[PDB]
Ligand SMILES: Nc1ccn([C@@H]2O[C@H](COP(=O)(O)O)[C@@H](O)[C@H]2O)c(=O)n1
Ligand SMILES: Nc1ccn([C@@H]2O[C@H](COP(=O)(O)O)[C@@H](O)[C@H]2O)c(=O)n1
Ligand SMILES: [Cu+2]
Ligand SMILES: [Cu+2]
Ligand SMILES: [Cu+2]
């Protein structure tokens with residue numbers, strides 16, 4: 001199913017971390033070009049402070065997908081929703097991705113697109129290597145996976161989910177908007193290299209991984 | 213309560229990661245000297261391949277605690293048990309620590325000693341920053357803390373716990389031996405800098421943190 005996915009790529013709000021360059025180019029660019037090459041991908045909706053709009057339209061013509069823009073919102077979920085407002089009337093999947101993960105493998109995006117297609121919603125994850133416990137309010141201890149991005153959701157579902165949060169309330173992140181839904185979320189096994197970039201010790205890391 | 217804690221320090225089995233030097237000295241040394249300075253600490257039981265025994269007795273005399281040695285075992289829990297076999301007849305707390313965490317703050321060890329004293333068992337933790345989910349066998353999604361070390365346990369309890377695993381079975385790590393017990397485990401809030409050292413991007417990190 002070709003050109004069937006709309007990407008919502010999150011890059012909104014010294015140098016803003018998803019623009020700190022990695023080897024040569026700003027961080028938001030690695031993931032951005034990965035999705036641009038996949039035939040599945042019809043259009044990209046970038047979520048960014050206009051000041052950074054240029055970082056993107058400068059490759060609009062060397063790219064076999066449609067570029068699009070929408071403005072961010074106050075919280076991580078408002079931007080997603082602003083992103084959602086611009087996607088092709090007829091896209092079958094929304095693929096929400098966070099700029100600060102520049103190292104997402106094409107092969108893992110393919111898998112999670114397939115799983116979001118089969119299930120309706122999927123997210124890439126890896127088995128948490130730390131010992132994690134739930135702790136109760138008295139600080140006593142009461143198979144776990146670490147969640148990454150993309151999250152791949154059918155847009156009808158994602159919308160049903162926005163409007164169930166909007167009616168009532170609450171976004172914590174297990175909040176996905178789609179946690180609340182009763183519809184299933186599949187977790188596609190990803191790669192420990194799809195790290196998120198925050199500390200320049202990440203970049204130090206990001207770089208080590210581009211070398212390998 | 214002075215000289216009331218026995219440390220069981222875990223450093224057993226190119227260069228074995230807890231001996232990769234940090235700035236100048238092997239990794240097992242940072243934590244080792246931290247515990248040596250605390251008046252609470254009566255003795256240290258180091259768990260190591262003898263080949264590395266020297267790394268330790270070379271400071272036996274510049275140290276206001278008793279040094280001790282025991283040999284490692286096949287799995288992480290067997291070494292602990294080998295460690296347990298050498299502690300002062302009358303220590304009130306066992307403080308189990310992993311060599312590969314060289315950056316444990318004195319202040320956090322103090323807290324967790326206190327909490328293990330009050331509760332009977334405590335471990336230092338920090339609120340996991342990742343989105344963690346439980347996933348079931350069909351790869352579908354069904355307050356979380358990341359666990360560190362030291363673990364501070366009264367030795368009588370720790371022994372009760374060894375023998376309840378020994379009778380029946382199973383050590384997963386939520387396995388602490390003390391998970392299984394019905395006795396409470398307190399989680400003392402630690403510091404995100406008590407990282408564990410594996411990748412030299414950790415060391416790259418360990419170093420950044422010694423600088424700060
Ligand atoms: N209001 C907001 C807040 C954060 N974000 C996203 O947060 C991402 C970076 O991760 P952190 O929020 O965890 O720092 C940015 O790429 C940005 O797109 C957003 O898109 N809108
Ligand atoms: N049999 C074993 C296996 C591991 N270990 C501990 O594992 C620690 C390092 O962490 P990892 O096992 O997670 O690599 C070492 O300091 C070592 O003491 C042990 O003490 N006995
Ligand atoms: Cu344009
Ligand atoms: Cu519009
Ligand atoms: Cu990080």
Ligand SMILES: [Cu+2]
Nearest residue numbers: 269272279280
């Ligand atoms: Cu000696």
Ligand SMILES: [Cu+2]
Nearest residue numbers: 282297298299
């Ligand atoms: Cu003995």
Ligand SMILES: [Cu+2]
Nearest residue numbers: 408410411414
């Ligand atoms: Cu690490």
